[PDB]
From TrEMBL, chain B:
It is found in: Apical cell membrane; Cell membrane. It is a multi-pass membrane protein. SUPFAM superfamilies: Calcium ATPase, transduction domain A, Calcium ATPase, transmembrane domain M, HAD-like, Metal cation-transporting ATPase, ATP-binding domain N. InterPro entries: ATPase_P-typ_cation-transptr_C, ATPase_P-typ_cation-transptr_N, ATPase_P-typ_cyto_dom_N, ATPase_P-typ_P_site, ATPase_P-typ_TM_dom_sf, ATPase_P-typ_transduc_dom_A_sf, ATPase_P-type_domA, Cation_transp_ATPase_P-type. This is Sodium/potassium-transporting ATPase subunit alpha.
Length: 266, 982
């Protein structure tokens, strides 16, 4: 229509610019109420999940010890995860602090405020992992039919685990058992290696203060070896964490527990 | 044709003998050669085919494609084990939606009828035929062309016959012309047109009196009534204007959806996506772009309007007919029975050298013309005493102008006039004993009666007579003026002349009345009279007055015609009656304005030939059927274009259909009003056909979309206004339902191109479609008019679409984008308050949906399992749904007016709007906390703030629409008004 094209295009440019500006302003107004130190709510995350290493697909661990290529992915995943727990990686004394080798009460490093600076982090020693650290056995129990898994509790800001009342009041217990009565006899003898010889998570690594107040944070680990798995069968194992603060769900199969199915072939 | 041949030439053409008739062998041979004398019923499509054709109409084809894509996605998700079971639910819901929409569409479509089933009580069952020189009563279905038949009074003519012998035969051709006046029949070629010939009897017509003999010339569907029925059944299979508008809207929406799907599939496959992600996105596009409940809502609104109008005695047989009245620009109206009362009544009186006007209302109980008591007592005595018509038994409390009468139409009019004025007619007749009576015959053209006065003071003989005005005058020698006698002269024989022509130029039949008092000396009390016109005198009477009769207009018809014309509608009279009566009735009902003149009125007022007057000075036209017969379609187009007032007179049903088609050829929506068999082809061909209830025939009522159950012409104006309101409210409903489509579609586009976790699911938006705004969509149909709706002009059928570019643009690119932004604000609020800042959500979708990742890290370093991410996704979906609901509340508020403000129109005046708002809130609450308590169908319980996050965006939508309409009102016809008004 000639000259009115400029007028209608100008109207639409102004209208869409105003719409974008109003949307951006509403987003800023909403984000002004959002803290960068602690989340507003923890409705979905507060009861932590229990997760294992290596990261696997369909929850199945299946390998043949005689073929190194069957467990290469598992070993690579374990190496990639544990590479940050090396002794050389925790040498900075201004960032890392040497908490006790025995379980203790949670360490309160202040409040969720930008003051007080970055919070120091307890060190976790790979030697505590035991037969599953890679220091001596580079295959983490694989290559021998005795696989290792590393259990971790999902990180939640300001969350302090509460071990159940009576034994150790500073360790959150974890146990791995066969899922069914068929798996309970073929699973074998479960070996646990935790810090100080206790099966669980020491409480001094809690609470977690976030990726901005506590970078380089190391969550506690608990390695589990099996060492007596029945060959050529699929054993279903259930690892569960116990605590007053720890809850479970029938819809979320990874909340406070997880399932792993391990088959070591011949 | 057969009416021009002689008896002998008819006996050679048809191989028949009038005396002997056809043989019994040739009768069967001709029954085999030509077939039975019956009307073949039309071929109707099966009901199940009609029902099944509605499963591929509207948006159903796109929904079928969506269901197919759902099945192909589920087979892929089953080959690679995925415990979803969500595409089957969506496909089943889409199929159910298709079925329900098809059911509604089937209920909306026009019902099928066989008008030939109404040509049933007119068809004779048996026929008296002459075969083998012996008369026998055979069935009329065995008649063959060339058969000699006999017809009597009160008989239906068994076929189209050429009368060879006739004796006092009169027939009723109301099935051909719409006129119930008896027609004299003879054996002589009288007029060139076969339909006006006096020597052809027509199939399925009534022989009123006399006897006749005829040869069958046409049989079965080859008859006049058979051709009328075939023409009625053939035409009238087109789509209503509202169906065309809905089809155009469906085309627009389907084209938009198809283009978007093609573009965003072609780009998605090139964005490193695989088949499942490319087809689930296509399903989402189809579901979001299609309004899944709008067509059923349209059907519901049409049903509601039809139910409302049925309470005003207006039966709507087709649902879509409630809108056609309202876009109609031309009304073609039958005269007799439709515009008039179909009852002859006394119209004018001429006595005392004065012309009086009589009341012609259907419900009248008095006459207000000047009853001077001089010459009026004599006129009333002649009217009451010189009538043979009497009321029928069982009618005493019935209104006088509604009672049934045995007798002539002219005598019935006089009897009802005398009963209205005098109250007692039978008693007065009984008091004045009738001692002689010469009945009315067409040869005499008068009726004589000798009575005895009810005056004991005098007790003389009073001989009264009525008849044709000229015969009465030439049988009269003295006149009565002001109650006193007076000799005739040129002063009173010319006043009579002028009065006779004045009354006869109004389309009225005039009757002359006179009396004579017999002397008591030469006619004593006994004096037995001889009816042989010997004993009593039959000349030198005393003229009293003239009375004229007409079939008058209905009381509510002139005002209805005036209001329809004021609404911009052209009213055309199409009648089978004679032009002189038709023109007068057109002037009476306002079809022809008082100032306007025809091409002959100017010639008479200028004393010149009709070729001297320019055809552009005349504003009215009266065209006869014979004038129309020699008219080329371009000539008819020019005649319809050049004249605003046209009267078509003496037309056949074929000519009525021709006129309707010529009116339709001018890009016009045409309404036809009729009440007879001869109107059925035009009632069928018209965009909307309206029939009369009490006065209408069954054939007319079967061919009509609408029936006026009380014969009230004012229902036409109410229907026009209702249709005009429907067309204005349907725009609001369509815009309201189209606004939410973009708000449902934008989340999927952002989900695909930006990798955000799915803002809303495909099942979730179906609840907005079919559960949340169904009642608001219905509520927008109860809106009132913003301006004077009857003061506009009819919309242009080719230029004023129901859905134009402005409506679609304002629904898609203006309010839908605002709603999408308002929903995305709540989406980001829900996600950020749990730990996922808006920047961290970009390209997070692949890792978000991985079932094997149970430690996904948020903006704070916390680790999330897959199920908690699923629950947060469902929470965001529910928040998006609630935001769409909240913004659709404001959309409902702003879509209830197109130009006016909420302050001017009123916020609480339409309570169905608040019912719809409450339904929206209640449905959202049930979904969020009923299906959220147990997480099902991607619904979770929300926090309180997520119901109010998007309120400011709704307020902004309302503010924007209010300002836009304010500046439309402030500057009419400006750049803003042209480009921003939808
Ligand atoms: C800093 C930013 C800025 C914005 C903001 O903050 C943020 O600040 C604030 C600023 C706010 C706006 C301020 C103002 C308005 C206009 C109002 O609507 C006009 C009011 C109407 C009148 O309403 C009557 O309704 C009653 C009815 O009985 C009256 O009694 C009673 O007096 C009166 O109330 C205007 O009507 C006129 O319309 C036509 C002229 O335009 C005239 O002709 C018409 O009439 C003809 C027949 O005569 C017909 O042909 C046609 O109908 C037609 O041509 C008509 O005569 C004339 O009346 C609707 C609300 C809105 C948008 C506000 C929204 C909220 C804000 C954006 C706030 C926001 C938060
Ligand atoms: C920030 C993001 C911005 C994204 C923008 C993307 C681009 C979208 C822009 C589209 C370009 C303009 C489209 C229309 C062009 C003119 C078409 C036209 O003039 O057509 C011919 C005629 C016009 O006569 P009428 O029907 O107007 O007169 C009716 C009679 N009366 C008015 C009396 C009632 O009409 C017909 O033949 C029928 C066609 C009428 C309808 C045409 C389609 C209108 C739909 C627009 C929506 C497009 C976007 C969809 C959603 C995208 C989501 C992101
Ligand atoms: C939330 C708050 C919303 C507030 C804004 C609401 C929008 C509506 C309010 C204002 C819009 C502008 C004012 C109204 C339009 C101008 C009125 C006017 O003065 O007359 C029209 C003029 C000249 O007419 P004429 O002489 O040809 O008429 C001759 C008529 N005869 C021939 C009969 C004599 O035409 C022109 O100048 C047209 C010039 C170009 C118009 C568009 C320019 C950019 C406008 C943007 C408005 C929207 C901004 C974004 C809002 C976002 C809301 C969320
Ligand atoms: C209709 C006219 C156009 C309307 C849209 C205009 C374009 C808008 C798109 C992007 C611009 C977003 C900018 C918003 C203002 C952000 C300024 C900024 O500082 O930037 C950073 C933010 C993220 O801050 P943070 O949370 O990391 O803060 C960290 C610390 N804190 C939590 C503590 C306070 O970046 C963010 O806002 C996240 C950006 C995510 C982009 C997603 C894009 C799609 C989402 C919505 C668009 C919907 C469009 C619907 C129609 C589409 C066409 C059909
Ligand atoms: C069935 C029970 C409710 C169940 C559903 C749950 C809650 C639904 C809530 C709906 C709120 C609707 C908007 C707020 C209404 C406030 C009520 C009120 O006191 O309003 C009064 C005014 C006046 O109205 P009037 O016609 O008497 O004019 C008289 C003025 N004179 C004479 C000068 C013309 O109303 C107006 O005009 C201004 C209207 C402003 C409309 C804003 C629309 C955008 C809001 C979206 C929020 C959605 C949630
Ligand atoms: C009608 C006005 C609507 C305004 C939208 C917000 C709704 C406000 C309406 C409230 C009335 C009904 C709701 C009653 C409850 C409201 C109070 C509330 O529960 O508020 C929720 C959030 C702030 O949560 P909080 O800090 O109390 O959490 C405490 C947890 N702790 C301590 C760890 C931080 O409010 C927010 O999200 C606000 C963020 C959304 C802002 C959108 C942009 C509005 C700009 C225009
Ligand atoms: C991305 C943004 C800026 C573009 C949005 C489109 C805006 C700017 C413009 C581009 C071309 C415009 C269209 C051009 C011509 C017509 C035809 C007319 O009969 C109705 C308006 C309509 C349909 C215009 C509506 C507004 C329009 C769609
Ligand atoms: C952003 C992209 C998708 C915008 C593309 C614009 C498309 C979707 C719109 C703009 C104009 C629209 C067309 C306008 C006119 C017609 C003619 C009608 O008889 C069928 C629909 C059809 C063919 C429409 C199809 C959809 C259409 C092509
Ligand atoms: N009682 C009557 N009913 C009808 N017409 C009558 C009567 N008395 C006299 N007439 C006159 O007789 C005329 C001729 O009547 P008729 O031959 O039946 O029909 P047409 O008027 O069509 O020729 C009428 O137009 C009318 O002027
Ligand atoms: C496991 O640890 C014990 C500790 O004594 C050691 O003797 C044994 O060799 C280890 N076995 C494996 C599987 O490395
Ligand atoms: F009643 Al008509 F033509 F006037 F059928
Ligand atoms: Mg009629
Ligand atoms: Na939709
Ligand atoms: Na019709």
């Amino acid at each position: 229509t000639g000259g009115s094209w400029f007028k209608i295009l100008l109207f639409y440019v102004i209208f869409y610019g105003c719409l974008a500006g109003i949307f951006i302003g509403t987003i800023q107004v909403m984000l002004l109420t959002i803290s960068e130190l602690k989340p507003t709510y923890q409705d979905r995350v507060a009861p932590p999940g229990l997760t294992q290493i290596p990261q696997i697909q369909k929850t199945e661990i299946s390998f043949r010890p005689n073929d190194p290529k069957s467990y290469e992915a598992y070993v690579l995943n374990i190496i990639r995860f544990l590479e940050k727990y090396k002794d050389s990686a925790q040498k900075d004394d201004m960032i890392f602090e040497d908490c006790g080798s025995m379980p203790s009460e949670p360490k309160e490093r202040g409040e969720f405020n930008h003051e007080r600076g970055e919070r120091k982090v307890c060190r976790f020693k790979l030697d505590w992992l035991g037969n599953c650290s890679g220091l001596n056995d580079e295959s983490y129990g694989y290559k021998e039919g005795k696989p290792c898994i590393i259990i971790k509790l999902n990180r939640v800001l300001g969350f302090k685990p509460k071990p159940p009342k009576n034994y150790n009041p500073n360790v959150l217990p974890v146990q791995c058992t066969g899922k069914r009565d068929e798996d309970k006899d073929k699973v074998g003898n479960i070996e646990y290696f935790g810090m100080g010889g206790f099966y669980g998570f020491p409480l001094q690594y809690y609470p977690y203060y976030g990726k901005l107040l506590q970078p380089k944070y190391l969550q506690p680990l608990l390695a589990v070896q099996f060492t007596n798995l029945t060959l050529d069968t699929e054993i279903r194992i259930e690892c569960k964490a116990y605590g007053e603060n720890i809850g479970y769900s029938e819809k979320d199969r990874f909340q406070g527990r997880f399932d792993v199915k391990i088959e070591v072939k011949s | 044709d057969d009416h021009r041949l002689s008896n002998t030439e008819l006996e050679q053409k048809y191989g028949t003998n009038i005396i002997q008739g056809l043989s019994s062998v040739r009768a069967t041979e001709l029954l085999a050669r030509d077939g039975p004398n019956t009307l073949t019923p039309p071929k109707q499509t099966p009901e199940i085919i009609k029902f099944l054709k509605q499963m591929v109409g509207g948006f159903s084809i796109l929904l079928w494609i969506g269901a197919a894509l759902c099945w192909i996605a589920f087979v892929i998700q089953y080959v690679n084990n995925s415990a979803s079971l969500d595409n089957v639910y969506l496909g089943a819901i889409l199929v159910l939606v298709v079925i329900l929409t098809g059911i509604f569409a089937y209920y909306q479509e026009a019902k099928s009828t066989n008008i030939m089933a109404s040509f049933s009580k007119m068809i004779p069952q048996q026929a008296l035929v002459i075969r083998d020189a012996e008369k026998k009563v055979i069935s009329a279905e065995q008649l063959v062309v060339g058969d000699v038949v006999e017809i009597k009074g009160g008989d239906q003519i068994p076929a189209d016959i050429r009368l060879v012998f006739s004796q006092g035969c009169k027939v009723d051709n109301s099935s051909l012309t719409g006129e119930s006046e008896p027609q004299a029949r003879s054996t002589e070629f009288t007029h060139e047109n076969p339909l006006e010939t006096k020597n052809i009897g027509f199939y399925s017509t009534t022989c009123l009196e006399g006897t006749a003999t005829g040869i069958v010339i046409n049989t079965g569907d080859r008859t006049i009534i058979g051709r009328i029925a075939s023409l009625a059944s053939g035409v009238g299979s087109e789509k209503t204007p509202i169906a065309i508008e809905i089809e155009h809207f469906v085309h627009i929406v389907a084209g938009v959806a198809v283009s978007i799907g093609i573009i965003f599939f072609i780009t998605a496959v090139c964005m490193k996506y695989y088949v499942l992600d490319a087809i689930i996105f296509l399903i989402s596009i189809i579901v979001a772009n299609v309004p899944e409940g709008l067509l059923a809502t349209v059907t519901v609104t049409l049903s509601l309007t039809a139910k409302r109008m049925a309470k005003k005695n207006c039966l709507v047989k087709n649902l879509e007919a409630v809108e056609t009245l309202g876009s109609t620009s031309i009304i073609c109206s039958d005269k007799t029975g439709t515009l008039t009362q179909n009852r002859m009544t006394v119209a004018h009186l001429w006595f005392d050298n004065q012309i009086f006007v009589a009341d012609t209302s259907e419900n009248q109980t008095k006459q207000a013309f000047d009853q001077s008591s001089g010459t009026w007592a004599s006129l009333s005595k002649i009217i009451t005493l010189c009538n043979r018509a009497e009321f029928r038994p069982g009618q005493e409390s019935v209104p006088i102008m509604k009672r049934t009468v045995v007798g002539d139409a002219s005598e019935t009019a006089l009897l009802k006039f005398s009963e209205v004025i005098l109250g007692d007619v039978m008693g007065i007749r009984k008091r004045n004993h009738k001692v002689a009576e010469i009945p009315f015959n067409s040869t005499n053209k008068f009726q004589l009666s000798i009575h005895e006065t009810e005056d004991p003071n005098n007790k003389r003989f009073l001989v009264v007579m009525k008849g044709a005005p000229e015969r009465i005058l030439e049988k009269c020698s003295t006149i009565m003026i002001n109650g006193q006698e007076q000799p005739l002269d040129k002063s009173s024989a010319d006043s009579f002349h002028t009065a006779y022509m004045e009354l006869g130029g109004l389309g009225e039949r005039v009757l002359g009345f006179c009396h004579l008092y017999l002397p008591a000396e030469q006619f004593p009390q006994s004096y037995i009279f001889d009816v042989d016109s010997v004993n009593f005198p039959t000349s030198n009477f005393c003229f009293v007055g003239l009375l004229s009769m007409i079939d008058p207009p209905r009381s509510t018809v002139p005002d209805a015609v005036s209001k329809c014309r004021s609404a911009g509608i052209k009213v055309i009279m199409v009648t089978g009656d004679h032009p002189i009566t038709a023109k007068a009735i057109a002037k009476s009902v306002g079809i022809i304005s008082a100032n306007n003149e025809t091409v002959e009125d100017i010639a008479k007022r200028r004393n010149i030939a009709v070729e001297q007057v320019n055809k552009r000075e005349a504003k009215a036209a009266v065209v006869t059927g014979m004038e129309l017969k020699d008219m080329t379609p371009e000539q008819l187009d020019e005649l319809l274009t050049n004249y605003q007032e046209i009267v078509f007179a003496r037309t056949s049903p074929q000519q009525k259909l021709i006129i309707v088609e010529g009116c339709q050829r001018q890009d016009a929506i045409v309404a036809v009003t009729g009440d007879g068999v001869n109107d059925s082809p035009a009632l069928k061909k018209a965009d909307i056909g309206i029939a009369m209830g009490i006065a209408g025939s069954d054939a007319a009522k079967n061919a009509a979309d609408m029936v006026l159950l009380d014969d009230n012409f004012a229902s036409i104006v109410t229907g026009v206004e209702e249709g005009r309101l429907i067309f204005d409210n349907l725009k609001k409903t369509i815009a309201y339902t189209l606004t939410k489509n973009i708000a449902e579609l934008c989340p999927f586009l952002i989900y695909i191109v930006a990798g955000l976790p799915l803002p809303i699911g495909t099942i979730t938006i179906l609840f907005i479609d079919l559960g949340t705004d169904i009642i608001p969509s219905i509520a927008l149909a109860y809106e009132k008019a913003e301006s004077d709706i009857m003061n506009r002009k009819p919309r242009h059928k080719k230029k004023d679409r129901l859905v134009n570019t402005q409506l679609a643009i304002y629904s898609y690119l203006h309010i839908g984008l605002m709603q999408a932004l308002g929903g995305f604000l709540v989406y980001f609020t829900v996600y950020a308050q749990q730990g996922f800042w808006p920047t961290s959500l970009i390209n997070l979708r692949v890792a978000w949906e991985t079932d094997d990742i149970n430690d996904l890290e948020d903006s704070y370093g916390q680790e999330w399992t897959r199920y908690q991410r699923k629950y947060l996704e469902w929470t965001g979906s529910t928040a998006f749904f609630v935001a769409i609901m909240i913004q659709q509340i404001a959309d409902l508020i702003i879509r209830k007016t197109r130009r006016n403000s909420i302050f001017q129109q009123g916020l609480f005046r339409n309570k169905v709007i608040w019912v719809g708002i409450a339904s929206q809130v209640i449905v959202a609450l049930i979904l969020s906390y009923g299906l959220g308590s147990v997480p099902a169908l991607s619904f979770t319980m929300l926090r309180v703030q997520y119901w109010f996050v998007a309120v400011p965006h709704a307020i902004l939508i309302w503010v924007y629409d209010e300002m836009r309409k304010l500046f439309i009102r402030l500057y009419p016809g400006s750049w803003w008004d042209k480009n921003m008004y939808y």
